[model samples]
Target: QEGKAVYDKACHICHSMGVAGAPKAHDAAAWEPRIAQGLDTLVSTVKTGKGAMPPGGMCTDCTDEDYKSAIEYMSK
Candidate 1:
């Protein structure tokens, strides 16, 4: 899906390696608490760069829906 494309483009470099606590792609264990907080909370984290993440989590061009989609993709 489009989220996968976005993940590859911007998120891959960090999440792929779980860099700086990024929570690696497909690592449901890492995403558990984040999933519990709901997608909007996750989106806000992306906006604020919670923990070691950078603003927009490196997807400077992403929309809210794009973040949602990417979150959904990675959580699964």
Candidate 2:
């Protein structure tokens, strides 16, 4: 799985419904502020973990680009 597929499987668990404060995927309102911080910041947070989110957003197999792709997928 890649891109949206990866997100659908792993990220969606929390993102879809905002579990543990994970931003809801496709909810532009929820993602707006974070997105404003820019992709690098988003990737950094996902890489280092923030709030209830764990490191790598639980996608250890994901590359930096993969994480970016997933973020773009969700934010859009």
Evaluate all candidate structures by whole-model CA lDDT and list the values in order. Answer: 0.85, 0.86
| lDDT of candidate 2 at residue 3, scale 0 to 100 | 77
Model 1, span 21-76: residue lDDT tens: 77889999998988999888888988888767878878878999999898888887
Error of 2 at 18 (Å): 0.6
Worst 10 residues of 1 by lDDT: 51-60
After the best TM-score superposition of candidate 1, give how far the Cα of residue 18 lies from its true spot, in angstroms: 0.4
Looking at candidate 1, what is the lDDT of residue 9? 86
Candidate 1 is scored at a TM of 0.90
Error of 2 at 22 (Å): 1.2
Root-mean-square deviation per candidate: 1.4, 1.2
Clashes of 2: 0
Flag clash pairs in model 1.
none
